[model samples]
Target chain A: HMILLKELKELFFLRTTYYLKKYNRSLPFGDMIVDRWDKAKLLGFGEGTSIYDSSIVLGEVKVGKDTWIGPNTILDGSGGGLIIGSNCSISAGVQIYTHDTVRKSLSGGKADIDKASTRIGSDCYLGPNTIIVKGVKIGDRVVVGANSLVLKDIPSDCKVFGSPAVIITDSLNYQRN
Target chain B: HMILLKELKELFFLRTTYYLKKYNRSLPFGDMIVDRWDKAKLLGFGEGTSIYDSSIVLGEVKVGKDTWIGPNTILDGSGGGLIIGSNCSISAGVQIYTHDTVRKSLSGGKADIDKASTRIGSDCYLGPNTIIVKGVKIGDRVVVGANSLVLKDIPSDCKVFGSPAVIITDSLNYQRN
Candidate 1:
């Protein structure tokens, strides 16, 4: 923890998220799709936000400014919708969904489409491959660990990890990996 | 639960499931080397099942009728093979692997390849970014939450979540999103 604090004190913030700021690692996905802010805005991306071209985002997903959306992420807002706030870091291979429709498609007995809006607040860090399901509301300044699965609402200033994404601590104080 | 149940009674259905739905989503992977159902038929994709473009599908994968595989997925069937039953919804960014060579690659030792068949029964819902590692079997009507890491066989009619994916509840009720 002390080392983490010391690193943050001397660190220089980049336009991209800390996870993606340090490039050079080979990626399995395609090349970065939208490098420039202008290119991203043209495709419904917000100001100062960078979403890699390799990302597969469905229509009508909104991300706030200065946020880093890493490569090969999937933001599927087609079923309902998604809203992510500013200064967030969604790491590589993360997937966010605003719907669950297993019941309606099978059995033919008429199942409700589990579609709902999913939201994430500001200044958050979602580690690699973290997934957020439909109807989840995440608060500000939260930190989610790698491969976490978020199935419920998360309050502000919390740090979470694990497959089910349980709260680890309150008032997060960590940077990227 | 009652509100959810009541809503299920009034839900409407869509008709794109029977193998080979239209190609519409924007993808980041390679070209649809095989777009037609007849072409996919040769590749072992059943009637009414569609694996969208831009996926990293290696070797042989057999999916049943009316299954929908979302975009940007990786099915590494190069190990053994993958068999998914009918009416399955494999959400975006999911990865199903039939082999694990981690030990062999890291230590230069014999690891047996760890390659084995991955099987999923009819009417399964794999949430977004859900990862099924080598040699896992999921029974009928099993629903896995988003970002869940499935490492073992899941019995039928079970709903599971979290890393290592323990059973959350029984007799699932949901839809594909």
Candidate 2:
């Protein structure tokens, strides 16, 4: 409501300082300045979905309604596409990629980068630091454990865990446990 | 070199806009205005060590020389202490913790958060999205694979991979791979 630029700057500085002192946490400056929902809307995400300022989304990405994309997450759709469905919880440090440079880099640029599409269905809960490789299609109501490296397609209503993730349980009564 | 405040602000706006258009990347405003090395130095990290401005570091933490702490990483020493040795590569999205709130939260705050000291030796390479739990001690020249969850002590000159990371190789002929 007609506040000066200097005042806004001071407010941000003070807020960040407070957080650092109280919680022993450092927050991104842009996050302090802007609204997460507004930023998500600007990125063309679906209605009611909110993405953190520190999260990175690139290329052709589509997200459905009421999703929460947490901080330090990367959704890379540069090679093809990435589609995430409704009511999903994409946790911190989650990385979903539609391409990889491993082959190209190993071949010294002789090979083309591997490319494919990655998709996640509705009501999925992706745990912290989980990595979804290119072309992996995850089904609905799935729960992926923390620090998992997903290299294959996952079926609906199940729990998967581990590096090169395997099915832990076929039936998952996921209720925020 | 002298610059006007208005000019600098305009330059930052333009640069961020350009990045958004070209790379589909969003950067923190503070990072655009400040230098990473200076921030690292301010955090009291060792000489030649550089930590990204986007990374979050908290509480009692000590780091040694020439280590590269990558973007979107978290180094949390809030509960006890966290120490890292020289020449380490802490890749993007790596989370190293010195405490866990699992016991406390599950018990509805009746119990205290599990606290301990976490230490990493020199010349180690922690891969992307790796999560190191509280109180783990790691030896020098260790290579942890991407998306691994480390829950145990690791000896020197070895490679570890997978969730609940176990030693994959006893001898690591350490070279940039």
Candidate 3:
């Protein structure tokens, strides 16, 4: 363990110094050198799915192949389950949840914390700062714009944008007007 | 330096082990041991300002006393300037910027990157995953909801919630409907 630890020190030291010199900045040691793909693999995600080290994944979440989960995102599957199909782009600061405490808090602890399964189909694009609450099922080929607060189910081959996201383009083949 | 390093190692080891045992999880060594207050002090933020280590602060950003900058946030002042007043709660995953490259990209390298000053006044609360674009001026006692995309100026004593945030409560002392 000491030998391996020494090797790690050297590697991280090199990385830290390189960043400080090249970019005039230095990040956390693990963030500077750790392989995101390896981290995803360790979490039992499917092949070719890469999740950034800063992203938090919790409780029975499943992802398909070739999906990219960006940094500082939260995938909370603590309620029932959370699943994502293949080739999805979950952008930075996106938060997808399968549980919420809103009902329980409003009810003064009498109501149960709401829980439901959330799913996202293949070829979806969830933009930066987007939030998807519990029980929402998003269909395939959906493009969700940045800073959306999605509270409803979005059918496949649609583009949605807004706070309570509404359909922008209903057909995938439709060109922008 | 070696002696201090050894002390840090022991401290972080204890912290890491405790988190692992108590929470069934572990975090990066530096994140486990580093003091948030000290980090803010090192960055020359005002007295009593606390910034999370995971937050990214860049280029001439200024913050006043007792501000709480949460984890995984980004404050970018690489353009003109970015400033925040005292006693603000800048929540997790929030991103505030003072520059935009959209104009340059749209102009195909003909136009320069747009730069502007962004400011947030004292006693404001910016919720999690909020995005404040370049040049947006926010006044004191403003309350912004989670996942908000702030693209315009907000006056003092207001509450706003939405994707492209609009005023919900204009008076800070007003009760909910």
Candidate 4:
């Protein structure tokens, strides 16, 4: 585990730099993933690394190439289902919830519950420490602000921010032109 | 560990919702605690769960019955003591500082490095993504808004919210009315 620890530390440093430079924020999950990936790549873990406890899969979660899911960030599917497309950056400490307490109430509060699945389209950039709640349908090319609490559905190519997040402007207009 | 996983999933969902419905903001230590508590509960761990290597705990620290402490949430206990009461909710990415740098500084640089602990009264509700700075004393039955930086003394029966954490009136006031 020393090699793993060393690699993880490096990855965390790189990730911290990337996040600080790219988004001016600190994302622990991104830091952790970058650290792990860097270590794995350096130690010949390559794409065959068996460290799957850090990675989570759900129903129809189609992650595209170059997708990064940070450590401790959970992709929930029990509520409904989660469908994530490719080329997305899901930062650390970001949590995606697929169910709600409404399910418990609907079931007469018997402690067993279920919720709707969340969907994230392709080319999306989920900022570090961002959270996506249940029953959300995010369109492609969406830029969710860092540390945002996404509660509702966001249309494609939109920039959503604020708690109980809402679309502040058009996301597609600010591409790297 | 299917039951554990399921419970974890549910805990995350509940924790996320609890923070969302309550605080509606994001901070470093506050965000971390949400995930930490979820993981701890899933593993059937109690309060004083040994934190991971990435975490840093500073100052006088006290954990509740089943609280989970996360990474990088600095619990600075230089000014006053940190006392966390039982049945409390501590979210992931949460940072707590007990003493301010002003008091913990020498004539020039270097920290004074005092030994004061931050105190938390019992049965308090701390939302996700919150930061409690130094020299702050939190009373019992208090509800700290998520993503809040508590830099002052919070009395009992109060519901504090916002970035600087203004008392959104008193929760007890509502009960009294």
In terms of TM-score, how similar is model 4 to the real structure? 0.59
Cα-based lDDT at residue B63, candidate 4? 61
Kindly list the per-residue Cα lDDT of model 4 for residues B1-177, writing each as its tens digit: 334334433544455345435643222222434455554454344554434334555444556563445443455544555666655555545677755556445546566654445677765656557887755788876777556778788998788876788888665532221
Q: Which stretches of candidate 4 lie over 4 Å from their true place?
A: A1-62, A71-82, A98-117, A175-177, B1-53, B70-73, B78-80, B102-117, B169-177
Each candidate's interface RMSD? 17.1, 7.3, 7.9, 13.1
Q: Enumerate residue pairs that collide in model 3.
A: none
lDDT of 1: 0.71
- Each prediction's whole-model lDDT (CA): 0.71, 0.79, 0.78, 0.59
lDDT tens readout by residue for model 4, A1-177: 787566556665766776789879775443323234432232222242221123333333334445666555556565656777666777766777675332222122232334777889878888877878778899999999987878789988899877657899988675678
- Residue B65 in candidate 1 has what lDDT? 83
TM-score of each: 0.74, 0.61, 0.59, 0.59
Worst 10 contiguous positions by lDDT, candidate 4 chain A: A102-111
Give me the candidate number with maximum TM-score: 1
- What tens-digit string does per-residue lDDT give for candidate 1 at B1-177? 233323322221111111113432333423223363554566678787777665677777888887778767787787778888887888888899998888888778866577888988888888877899988999888888777889999998889887778898874445333
Model 4 chain B lDDT-worst window of ten: B24-33
Give fnat for candidate 3. Answer: 0.09
Q: What's the candidate order when arranged by decreasing DockQ?
A: 1, 2, 3, 4
- Given candidate 4, what's the lDDT at residue A124? 89
Q: Which run of 10 residues does model 2 chain A get worst, by summed lDDT? A: A101-110
Write candidate 2's Cα lDDT for A97-145 as tens digits.
Answer: 8876433322222345579999999999999988998899999999999
